[PDB]
C-alpha cells in the first residue's frame, strides 16, 4: 500500500535488471554505480525525490577551491545539472538533483540518475585544475 | 555486482549496493 516513490524504485530496478532494492531506516536507497560513483536516492518529500551523488570527503588543505566549486556551479546552472553542495555530517561533497514525482516514470528516474553520474564523472573536467 | 541490460540511459556495467566516499544515511535539516 506504498506511495509512488516505492513503486518507481521497484519498476526502475525492473527496467535495468538488477533485481530488487528498497528504502532504508533513513528514507533513502544508496547504490554505487561502478563502485566509484556513489548515488543515494532519497524520497525527501511527498512531491519529490532528491538524487544525491556523493563525491567523497571535501579537501581542507589550502581549500581555496571551495570558491572554485562555487564557481563551477555556474556551469551546472546553465546546463541544468545538479547543484554542487557541501554537506557537514560527512564533510563530503555532493551533487544534488531534485526529481519530482508527478508524471514520473522508470525511464525518467534512470535518465536523471545517470545525469548525476555524468556530473560526477565530468566534474574534474568542469574545473580549472 | 549487478549487471544492467537495459535500453535506458545506464549504458554502464554494474551496480554495487552500499549497506573514499561516505554514502551517508542522513544530512542535517536543522
Author numbering:
A (entry chain A): 1 to 129
B (entry chain B): 35 to 53, 65 to 75
Sentences from the study reporting this entry:
Enteropathogenic Escherichia coli injects effector proteins into host cells using a type III secretion system (T3SS).
Here, we present the co-crystal structure of a C-terminal truncation of CesT in complex with an N-terminal fragment of Tir. The Tir32-80-CesT138 complex produced crystals in the trigonal space-group P322 with one molecule of the complex in the asymmetric unit. Diffraction data were collected to 2.74 Å resolution and the structure was determined by molecular replacement. Residues 130–138 of CesT138, the N-terminal histidine tag, and residues 32–34, 54–64, and 76–80 of Tir were not included in the final model due to poor or absent electron density. Tir residues 35–53 adopt a β-hairpin-like fold and extend the 5-stranded β-sheet core of CesT138, while also being pinched between α1 and orthogonally below by α3 of CesT138. Tir residues 65–75 are bound along the concave surface of the β-sheet core of CesT138. Specifically, Tir residues I38 (purple), L44 (cyan), and L49 (cyan) anchor the β-hairpin-like peptide to CesT138; and L69 plus three additional proline residues make a second point of contact with the β-sheet core of CesT138. Interestingly, the CesT C-terminus occupies the same binding surface as Tir residues 65–75 (pink), despite significantly different sequences. Taken together, the structural data from the Tir32-80-CesT138 and CsrA-CesT complexes suggest that (i) CesT exists as an unswapped dimer, (ii) the Tir binding region of CesT exhibits significant plasticity that could accommodate the binding of multiple effectors with varying sequences, and (iii) the C-terminal extension of CesT is required for CsrA interaction that in turn could also prevent CesT from binding Tir.
